[PDB]
């Protein structure tokens, strides 16, 4: 697997190159404001197509079976959208930048508040772009890995592979921090701080999901991967 | 924040709650109602001990009573779950709810969450999770799970304090791993592996919570237990 042979700098470059664009909502500026869920749904749907193509470019992801790729996307898709949102909003305190033309302030609200808090935490930590892309790849590979159903040798090999790629991303995070001049103690503290925010992202995804053809099915994701 | 890694570990080990028994001799086999009855009774008794444990986690009682309650509100089910997973580590294919309530997957059909718990227990076994590591992780859940959902200078001071204590627990985890002879690379990889499982514990708590709704200790109950 090429993935396992990457240096930290190569991993970062691959992830940066794979980044999807920031999409715009279909809000027509020449028409009055007088649907929020309509705009968000349309935006998320377009984002999903880009997510699939991004996932295929995350080192190690295409080494997995199509089935395992789908399972990872099924578990991670909303967390991935959410972490993208929080990243885009980092420099807009008190606001969520769903798209450059869909920037919402606080004044539904429960999940909004949680997203704002995550954005504030990212700001307070001075989260870097190189760190963000590592975290988003971790979500992809980690969120679904504990819930594989198969007992086959192949499934065991798949989980081992995922954990080895995750290990490489950890190494990458640490390398970035070391190059930035953090002491060994600071490197381990910051790694922990970043990974603990993943627990909050999960929580938000679960709450978002309960706040509810909405979720992409296994079959839809499989078709999108094969296409 | 004055504690060394060794002192932190000792404090956490000394704080550990007891393992409780489920009510003695239920009618078996179980109904849906009677199984949920037994588990509820066990969890309710466990909660009292959890509060006592929480008060002994370094840094926890430095917080306002209000902030202590909020942390427990967010973390209580995850804490119960990680305790269950720990107890079950040496019983492959089974969940050791209590020494007298050991259930295999064949028993209890809600099976989705059962399977997730079993998978976590398998992951802990495969990693050879150590007791010293377990207690660090449980304390992280307590301090981390509610911290992102805390404007006054006092609240900023509270969150900063929590993050400083969390930093100390990370240092403690690393110290343990270094003493065990892991290379620096191994230490960071294992730390990440352990912290990523916490995301799965959250997921399980959220799913468990939705299942309990298809429940929570009240603010008042938690406050009373803390004050008592
Ligand atoms: C009435 O107005 C609202 C608006 C939003 C909210 N929410 C809370 C908050 F406002 F954000 F605070 S929310 O409910 O939490 C929502 C935000 C986040 O979680 C949900 C979501 C999302 C995803 C897909 C989707 O529809 C896609 C359906 N299709 C996908 C498969 C194929 C076909 C179906 C709609 C929403 C998210 C998301 C999307 C894109 C993004 O960039 C970032 C985050 C509440 C009320
Ligand atoms: C009909 O049979 C079942 C049995 C279990 C399940 N679940 C899945 C699984 F089997 F475990 F796999 S589950 O629903 O996910 C359940 C497992 C875990 O999560 C929940 C639970 C729990 C906690 C508190 C509670 O009641 C608390 C009520 N009081 C709180 C204070 C104020 C008063 C109210 C009931 C259940 C658990 C738990 C308890 C103690 C422990 O040590 C570790 C884990 C489904 C159906």
Task: Enumerate residues preceding breaks in chain B (C to N > 2.5 Å).
Answer: 109, 150, 214
* Token representation of residue A69: 């790729």
CA atoms within 13 A on the CB side of A77: 23
Answer whether A25 touches B (CB < 8 Å): no
Beta bridge partners of B95: B103
Domain spanning A1-227, CATH architecture: Orthogonal Bundle (1.10)
Q: Chain B interface, mutation test: which of A137, A146, A172, A205, most B Cβ atoms within 10 Å?
A: A146
Q: Which helix (H) or strand (E) holds B97?
A: strand B94-98
Which ligand is nearest to the Cα of residue B108, counting in written order?
2
For residue A39, give Cα distances in angstroms to A14, A33, A144: 31, 11, 28
Beta bridge partners of B102: B96
Which bin fits A226, alpha (ψ -120 to 50), beta or left (φ > 0)?
alpha
Q: How far is CA A55 from the centre of its chain?
A: 10
For residue B190, give Cα distances in angstroms to A170, B134, B200: 10, 13, 16
Q: Which residues does chain B have within 8 Å of residue A142's beta carbon, measured at their own beta carbons?
A: 196, 199
At residue B19, the 3 state secondary structure works out as coil
Neighbours of B86 (CB within 10 A): 20
3-state helix/strand/coil string of A128-183? CHHHHHHHHHHHHHHCCHHHCCCCCHHHHHHHHHHHHHHHHHHHHHHHHHHHCCCC
Q: Which residues does chain B have within 8 Å of residue A195's beta carbon, measured at their own beta carbons?
A: 192, 195-196, 198
Tokens 């949102």 correspond to what residue? A85
Scanning B202-221 for CB atoms below 8 A from A yields 202-203, 206-207, 210
Answer whether B19 touches A (CB < 8 Å): no
CA of A224 to the centre of ligand 1 (A): 20
Q: How far is CA A130 from the centre of its chain?
A: 13
Find out whether A57 is annotated in a ligand binding site. Answer: no
At residue A127, the 3 state secondary structure works out as coil
For residue B97, give Cα distances in angstroms to A111, B111, B117: 33, 15, 11
Q: Which helix (H) or strand (E) holds B98?
A: strand B94-98
Answer whether A126 touches B (CB < 8 Å): no
The CA distance from A175 to B184, in Å, is: 12
Enumerate the domain spans of chain B: 1-228
User: What are the φ and ψ backbone dihedral angles of B91, each rounded to 5 degrees?
Assistant: -130, 70
Tokens 């926890």 correspond to what residue? B60
What is the full DSSP assignment across A48-106? HHHHHHHHTTSTTGGGS-HHHHHHHHHHHHHHHHHHHHHHHHTTSTTEEEEETTEEEE-
For residue B38, give Cα distances in angstroms to A72, A79, B32: 35, 35, 10
For the CA of A115, the nearest atom of ligand 1? 12
Residue B65's contacts (CB-CB under 8 Å, 6 or more residues apart) are B223, B226, B227
For residue B191, give Cα distances in angstroms to A30, A67, B60, B118, B137: 52, 29, 22, 21, 10
Q: Which residues does chain A have within 8 Å of residue B200's beta carbon, measured at their own beta carbons?
A: 146
What's the reported resolution, in angstroms, to a tenth? Answer: 1.6
The CA distance from A210 to A57, in Å, is: 30
Residues in chain A, total = 227
* Token representation of residue B203: 């997921």
What is the full DSSP assignment across B137-180? HHHHHHHHTTGGG---HHHHHHHHHHHHHHHHHHHHHHHHHHHT
CB–CB of B119 and A171 under 8 A? no
The CA distance from B171 to B5, in Å, is: 7
Which bin fits B189, alpha (ψ -120 to 50), beta or left (φ > 0)?
alpha
At residue B121, the 3 state secondary structure works out as helix
Q: Which residues does chain A have within 8 Å of residue B199's beta carbon, measured at their own beta carbons?
A: 142-143, 198-199, 201-202
At residue B30, the 3 state secondary structure works out as coil
Answer whether B152 touches A (CB < 8 Å): no
For residue B58, give Cα distances in angstroms to A8, B1, B7, B63, B173: 36, 8, 10, 11, 15
Find out whether A47 is annotated in a ligand binding site. Answer: yes
The CA distance from B33 to A18, in Å, is: 51
CATH number for region B1-228: 1.10.565.10
Neighbours of A217 (CB within 10 A): 11
* Token representation of residue A14: 């691959």
Residue A73's contacts (CB-CB under 8 Å, 6 or more residues apart) are A51, A52, A55, A140, A144, A216, A221, A225
Dihedral angle over CA of A84, A86, A91, A96, nearest 10: 110
The CA distance from A106 to A119, in Å, is: 13
Residues having CB within 6 Å of any atom of ligand 1: A 36-37, 40-41, 43-45, 47-48, 78, 81-82, 84-85, 98, 108, 111-112, 115, 208, 211, 213-214, 216
Which ligand is nearest to the Cα of residue B96, counting in written order?
2
Of B205, B208, B226, B227, nearest to B47 by C-alpha is B226
Neighbours of B222 (CB within 10 A): 23
CB–CB of B193 and A166 under 8 A? yes
Are the C-beta atoms of A204 and A115 separated by less than 8 Å? yes
């Amino acid at each position: 697997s090429l993935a396992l042979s990457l240096t930290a700098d190569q991993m970062v470059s691959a992830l940066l190159d794979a980044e999807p664009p920031i999409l715009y909502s279909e809000y027509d500026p020449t028409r009055p404001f007088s649907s929020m869920m309509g705009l968000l749904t349309n935006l998320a749907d377009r984002e999903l197509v880009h997510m699939i193509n991004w996932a295929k470019r995350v080192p190690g992801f295409v080494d997995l079976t199509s089935h395992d790729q789908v399972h990872l996307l099924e578990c991670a898709w909303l967390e991935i959208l959410m972490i993208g949102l929080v990243w885009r909003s980092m420099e807009h305190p008190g606001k969520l930048l769903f798209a450059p033309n869909l920037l919402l302030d606080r004044n539904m609200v429960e999940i909004f508040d949680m997203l704002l808090a995550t954005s504030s935490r990212f700001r307070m930590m001075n989260l870097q772009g190189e760190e963000f892309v590592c975290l988003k790849s971790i979500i992809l590979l980690n969120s679904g890995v504990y819930t594989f159903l198969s007992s086959t040798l192949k499934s065991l090999e798949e989980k081992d592979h995922i954990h080895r790629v995750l290990d490489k991303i950890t190494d990458t995070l640490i390398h970035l921090m070391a190059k930035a001049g953090l002491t060994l103690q600071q490197q381990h503290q910051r790694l922990a701080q970043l990974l603990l925010i993943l627990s909050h992202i999960r929580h938000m995804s679960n709450k978002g999901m309960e706040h509810l053809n909405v979720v992409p099915s296994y079959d839809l994701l499989l078709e999108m991967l094969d296409a």
